[PDB]
Amino acid sequence: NLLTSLVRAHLDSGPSTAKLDYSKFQELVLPHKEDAGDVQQFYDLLSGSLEVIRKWAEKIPGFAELSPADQDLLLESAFLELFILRLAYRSKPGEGKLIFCSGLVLHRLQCARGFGDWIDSILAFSRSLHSLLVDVPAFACLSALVLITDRHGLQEPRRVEELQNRIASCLKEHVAAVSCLSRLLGKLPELRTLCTQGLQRIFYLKLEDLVPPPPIIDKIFMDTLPF
Amino acid sequence: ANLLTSLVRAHLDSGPSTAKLDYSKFQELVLPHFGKEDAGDVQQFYDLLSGSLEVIRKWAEKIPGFAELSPADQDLLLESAFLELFILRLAYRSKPGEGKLIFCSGLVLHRLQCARGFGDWIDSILAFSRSLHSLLVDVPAFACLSALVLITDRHGLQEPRRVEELQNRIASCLKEHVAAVASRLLGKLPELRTLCTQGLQRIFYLKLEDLVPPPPIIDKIFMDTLPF
Ligand SMILES: CNc1nc(C)c(-c2ccnc(Nc3ccc4[nH]c(C(=O)NCCCN5CCOCC5)cc4c3)n2)s1
Q1: Between 3.40.50.300, 1.10.565.10, 2.10.10.20, 2.60.40.1520, what CATH number should domain B2-9+37-223 receive?
Q2: Which family does it belong to (chain A)?
Q3: What are the Cα distances from residue A64, in Å, to A1, A80, A140?
């Protein structure tokens, strides 16, 4: 029932296989490495997930019973990790095909310019995720475990740990019912490292300042830098 | 010129002699775990940056007129040019055909000993060293250009006019020197700007990772150069 709730929240947070949008998709991308249009698209694809990941989190049983300050800190801290995990899972790295939570489908070369090298690190992680063959219930727990985790400055870190423990127990109980758990849990630290390169990319783009990040992305960037 | 002689004296006294080179840490083939670093690699990176800053401070003090600029303008010019000057002097000093980095202390390090602390940036600096060496910039021309990288317009100068006059004088000194032995050297100054950005990206990464914290003086240059 926790599991059922987590699966409901996951499946309601992404596009139906029918609401997929191939109208912008380019099978072969023309030759011709960074313009204002590329930076705008990068911030737009990031910003497309903000509202979606907040509504998903609010359907995680227990999440709305954390303090409003802890809810905000967990969302800000996990935003990039959750954006990458959900993109990695949804996408088709065998075809270099990125599927965004709007249902927009883009080839890697159509967003490489905004993303920089990071998009190739994200596709490598997507290919490693796909090889584990994570079933939707397992992924509905894992994604919740990315958000519901210790972060510096939590008001009720013990209640965050207890909710994490419940979701971890829900996941272990599910993987047993169908060494493989620890390969799943192994993807969490890899996701943390991957999203360091996301923070590196935003730093570079703010230095370059072709187009500034929209306020909410800028705040996540500034707030998650320990300095 | 008298200015030229002073600029050449300041330049030559700010690095090692082909005789005061410490091969004491040099190893032609180390075997590193690439794309990773330990506390020792990050501390040495910051130590080389700190040593270069102290050396570039004494060098600037010997540029005639620099020490009479306001103390605040001296600090702003040094902070704003530091990374540019570190890269330019390292590229000019180094031996990229042997993968040899030569630091202002005279310390010689192989490319492979620098890869852990510096990351990609050390390989981009050696590529710039190859482009610089193929221009065959004579010592006096380099002693002028390096001074022109420091003594330039910056946002927040108290006496921008005195900095422009000193710039004007060093430019005149340089033009009258190239004429005295008779634009390509100055088309790699944008390449040098890119290498500064890479330097800032590497410090950002290392501050994120925080194995050891940056020295306060380097940290201030980093924070003061970022518009945010
Ligand atoms: C602004 N002030 C300054 N300017 C600089 C850069 C300074 C400095 C401080 C100490 N030593 C030196 N100079 C130095 C020392 C040793 C050197 N060896 C060579 C050399 O062999 N090259 C030949 C060029 C051909 N390529 C090199 C080999 O790999 C590829 C081909 C130059 C050199 C310069 N400068 S303080």
Answers
A1: 1.10.565.10
A2: Belongs to the nuclear hormone receptor family. NR4 subfamily.
A3: 17, 21, 17
